Amino acid sequence: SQALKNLLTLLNLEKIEEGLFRGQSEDLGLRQVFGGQVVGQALYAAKETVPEERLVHSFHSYFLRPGDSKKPIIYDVETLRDGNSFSARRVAAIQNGKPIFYMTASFQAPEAGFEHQKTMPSAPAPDGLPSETQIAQSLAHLLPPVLKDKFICDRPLEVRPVEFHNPLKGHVAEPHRQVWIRANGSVPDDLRVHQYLLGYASDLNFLPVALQPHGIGFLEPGIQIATIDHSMWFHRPFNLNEWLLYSVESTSASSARGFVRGEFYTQDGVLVASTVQEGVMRNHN
Amino acid sequence: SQALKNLLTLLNLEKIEEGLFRGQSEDLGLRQVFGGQVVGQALYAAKETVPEERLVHSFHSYFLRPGDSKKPIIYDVETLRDGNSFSARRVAAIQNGKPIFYMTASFQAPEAGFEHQKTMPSAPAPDGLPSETQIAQSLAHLLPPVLKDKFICDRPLEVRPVEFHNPLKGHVAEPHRQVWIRANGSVPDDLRVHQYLLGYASDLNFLPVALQPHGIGFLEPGIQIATIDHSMWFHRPFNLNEWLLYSVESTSASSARGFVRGEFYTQDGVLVASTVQEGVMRNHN
Numbered sequence A, B: 001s002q003a004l005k006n007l008l009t010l011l012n013l014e015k016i017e018e019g020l021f022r023g024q025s026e027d028l029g030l031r032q033v034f035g036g037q038v039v040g041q042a043l044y045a046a047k048e049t050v051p052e053e054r055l056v057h058s059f060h061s062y063f064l065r066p067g068d069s070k071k072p073i074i075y076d077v078e079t080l081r082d083g084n085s086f087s088a089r090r091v092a093a094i095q096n097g098k099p100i101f102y103m104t105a106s107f108q109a110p111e112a113g114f115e116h117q118k119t120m121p122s123a124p125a126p127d128g129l130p131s132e133t134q135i136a137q138s139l140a141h142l143l144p145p146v147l148k149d150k151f152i153c154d155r156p157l158e159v160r161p162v163e164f165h166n167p168l169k170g171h172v173a174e175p176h177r178q179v180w181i182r183a184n185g186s187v188p189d190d191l192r193v194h195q196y197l198l199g200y201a202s203d204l205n206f207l208p209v210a211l212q213p214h215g216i217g218f219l220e221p222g223i224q225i226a227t228i229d230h231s232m233w234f235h236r237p238f239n240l241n242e243w244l245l246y247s248v249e250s251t252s253a254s255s256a257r258g259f260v261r262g263e264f265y266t267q268d269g270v271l272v273a274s275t276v277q278e279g280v281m282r283n284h285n
């Protein structure tokens, strides 16, 4: 459970000045910075500069350089606009004197209006599915004692895939994936926190779906995937303490790029948010 | 023919300086600037500052204020990055000393890579379908020609809807729409041009689809819709001199906002581009 509090602490940026923050990275595997961390932290920085009643409803972002998790990241927020209804902000993520990421987010106050939504796709309940932590721990029995011990996944989130796609091997399959996600611990009763946490989560089990028709795992040798842009629209309020289905599809792949679109639904079938991302996808020999 | 020539001319911006242009606004219908005009002009501006071999593959944009078509628009391009593969640019559309819109676009040179795509949805051929212009002429067989002798056919694009949704009245219908589109004249043999023309076109028959479940047309009195953000990914090359199916869906509407996702297909079924947009949707009484 320490993992979730460690993530929430990590997303709660250190203020250097108005609209100027500093964030730590890492710690959980792989040296490059996880895209979700940048998204989550950029969202925090952005919301800190917006009227409290205005919640993020959308954001667009482009990744320009790989982030180094050994170094902190500086987030500089620019106020683009504050109208009778919307507040827009642009966040620059900086490391080594260069922008590594830009996000533009829009915020709006709560309001009733036209309501309609796509019907949730059918998917088996999370109850009968193993978590990625279970799957990893089972695969770890393949490692020798020296390595088996040190490893282990204490995660801030719990993920139960409908179909498991091993990133180390990969098998041919339709460009669709469904995973169930929820916080592995208690998330504060503040919707804003749930939002940037979902922002964080939205970058998991996403881009890799574009590799399925080609049976390649994203961690295999010679395979390189990297996010170019990540966008999200928060349609309705939600509680990440409860399950959410992340329904993902890859409608296209071409010119060394992979494209994916996702949707988050509550177990009861409420459409909570939508996501879109394109990233580099190369097979180097 | 003239209408297409006029639009292409209007999209061909006047250069004030490097990465600094000036664009005129359409006379063609509606005092407020058509979003498509801004998108098309911003793309032109961006592409002018990019290496010739690198074609736009995606862009994100936000509209901050309504544009006045009675005035020109200044487009200021900022170079965000020029890497071994990708070039990124941010375009600011200014009018009245204020930004009315921002777009960030990414460009990449052609390359061979993983290929796969969603299967084109079923749709009738454009052959037996009347154009919107034809439909307008048909429904207009009434009232004094005094006004009927001014509003007519000449559009830069020909649009043939699979199902007609009258913006003036509107009827309840599932949140899906299909319209066939092609240039009404000859587009020069430059993919870049076809691309920003498609950008222009991508803002048509889009957002209104979110109003369908509610049986309201966007030209009805007291009904207000306005684009907040428009994004697009150019998956493959295409020829706007030929027919393209614009398949649109509205997966959600809430909090006075409407969300739509679109896809362009060649008649032969090739997925050419994807779009996503959210906009304000209000009924003022």
Ligand SMILES: CCCCCCCCCCCC[N+](C)(C)[O-]
Residues within 6 Å of the ligand: A029, A030, A034, A035, A167, A203, A204, A206, A207, A208, A218, A219, A225, A226, A227
């Ligand atoms: C051996 C530990 C098991 C964890 C494997 C970690 C893989 C890194 C996954 C995050 C990569 C996300 N993405 C789309 C940007 O590639």
Ligand SMILES: CCCCCCCCCCCC[N+](C)(C)[O-]
Residues within 6 Å of the ligand: B029, B030, B034, B035, B167, B203, B207, B208, B218, B219, B225, B226, B227
């Ligand atoms: C008889 C009136 C038919 C409408 C003529 C106006 C065409 C311009 C349409 C652009 C409107 C775009 N949108 C979604 C922002 O409303």
